[PDB]
Paper text:
SAS-6 organizes the rotationally ninefold symmetric cartwheel, an early assembly intermediate of centrioles that participates in establishing their symmetry and diameter. The cartwheel is organized through the homo-oligomerization of the highly conserved centriolar protein SAS-6. High-resolution crystal structures of zebrafish and C. reinhardtii SAS-6 fragments together with biochemical and biophysical characterizations demonstrated that two dimerization interfaces in SAS-6 mediate this oligomerization: a coiled-coil domain that forms a rod-like parallel dimer; and a globular N-terminal domain that forms a curved head-to-head dimer. SAS-6 is a highly conserved protein that is found in all eukaryotes that have cilia/flagella during some of their life-cycle stages.
However, with the wild-type construct of Lm SAS-697–320, we finally succeeded to find a crystal form of the space-group H3 that diffracted to a resolution of ∼3.5 Å along the l-axis with anisotropy limiting the resolution along the h-k plane to ∼4.2 Å. Using the structure of the Lm SAS-697–274 B–C homo-dimer as a search model, a molecular replacement solution could be found that allowed the subsequent placement of the coiled-coil part present in the construct. The unit cell of the Lm SAS-697–320 crystal form contained three 9-fold symmetric SAS-6 rings with three SAS-6 dimers constituting the ASU. These three dimers were highly similar to each other and overlayed with an rmsd of 0.88 ± 0.29 Å in secondary structure matching with 357 ± 14 selected pairs. The inner diameters of the SAS-6 rings are ∼19 nm and correspond well to the diameters of cartwheel hubs observed in vivo. In the crystal, SAS-6 rings are stacked onto each other. Neighbouring rings interact through inter-digitation of their coiled-coil domains in an antiparallel way. The ASU of the crystal contained six SAS-6 monomers that are labelled from A–F. No clear electron density could be seen for the distal part of the coiled-coil of the A–B dimer, probably due to the lack of stabilizing crystal packing interactions compared to the C–D and E–F dimer. However, we demonstrate that under high protein and precipitant concentrations, a L. major SAS-6 construct crystallized as ninefold symmetric rings with a diameter very similar to cartwheel hubs in vivo; this provides the first unambiguous experimental evidence that SAS-6 is able to form ninefold symmetric cartwheels on its own. However, in our ring structure, both of these critical interfaces are similar in their orientations to those observed in the crystals of the Lm SAS-697–320 F257E and the Lm SAS-697–274 constructs that did not crystallize as rings.
Numbering used by the authors:
A (entry chain D): 130 to 317
B (entry chain C): 129 to 317
C (entry chain E): 208 to 264
């Protein structure tokens, strides 16, 4: 049953205090599926990546059971099913340029190697002030987890490359064979 | 004079995790000369062994030109540092291509890949009398940091190669569809 | 700036009192009775389908 609701790139204001923030394009991947202690809990996963840096991998994994606390702390007004649906709605809207909002990501230290987390925020600028719409703490991944990520994406695109070899090979042949039919129609 | 992949292919290898019974698997073999070492200006030979069915199966022997004389004496080799990878690869390519009578073997120092930190790679000749060993190389399993680079490297590679095949498909799918519409109208005439 | 803060604050609150605002006012004390409290948090809240969005505190 797992399902990716969003997988795209978006400019994000990343900040490693006390350094000055700087805008980078970042990957956003959001996927629902199954996990937890006994592997039968519904999960929502939020994943943040940097195409310019393979080790830049921050994730929030949310188990359905922990959600009531989550909904309360963040004052959400949707159930576990709508949360990732609205989150990607909000984020995709920003990435699409249809949003007045901007994306921000603040790490808990001045360097990436010493950080273990970041707070990703959806921010609105008004004349009065920046208004915060949502806040999520994302944890930086551990190596073993990370190896899987790379290895996962490694295996993924290797297949996808081969698949395009198959598509190129079949369609090259169909339409190349079509020249010969329509060559005889020209002869007519 | 400049770095070079001398070999990058797949070949059947007899893999053995003692005390378990050996088993034959297809393994990746990559052999590359280039620059490396303590000060990064030493000529190196790299031998890399992989398993397409297993991303963590990543074993390497890295050899520095400074270290080679010991290597040469110990293994009773009769070529210099420059010829060694050409002949190693000569031998391996002969095997992968099927032109060799020889076989490949890889024996781990433990019962699981997870518990190993090394393996011995051997080129073996079967005779009526006995197995005759032609060469043996110990390869070390990589530390996490090394491996993450390998995966990330291969990650970025095939992501691009995929993108390129979309471009190639786009070229051929679009032109040839454009040709169908032209000559389909020529049939209509 | 300091000059605008009360203008926008009052802008926001006055907007609410007149009924021209979509926003609501909230006040949460640090205890269960007024006699034991010494403070409260006053918030301007926006209701969305997704969540309450806080505008000022």
């Amino acid at each position: 049953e797992p399902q990716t609701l969003l997988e795209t790139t978006v400019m994000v204001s990343t900040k490693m205090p006390p350094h000055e923030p700087q805008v980078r394009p970042l990957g956003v991947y959001v996927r629902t599926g199954r996990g937890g202690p006994n592997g039968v809990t519904r999960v929502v996963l939020v994943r943040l990546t940097d195409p310019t840096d393979p080790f830049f991998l921050f994730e929030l994994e949310l188990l359905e059971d922990d959600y009531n606390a989550f909904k309360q702390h963040l004052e959400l007004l949707v159930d576990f099913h709508g949360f990732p649906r609205y989150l990607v709605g909000m984020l995709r809207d920003i990435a699409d340029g249809a949003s007045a909002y901007e994306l921000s990501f603040v790490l808990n230290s001045a360097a990436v190697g010493d950080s273990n987390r970041g707070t990703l925020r959806v921010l609105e600028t008004t004349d009065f002030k920046t208004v915060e719409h949502i806040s999520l703490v994302l944890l930086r991944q551990g190596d073993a987890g990370l190896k899987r990520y790379l290895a996962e994406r490694f295996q993924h695109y290797e297949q996808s490359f081969r698949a395009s070899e198959a598509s190129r090979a079949v369609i090259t042949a169909e339409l190349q064979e079509k020249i010969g039919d329509l060559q005889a129609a020209n002869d007519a």
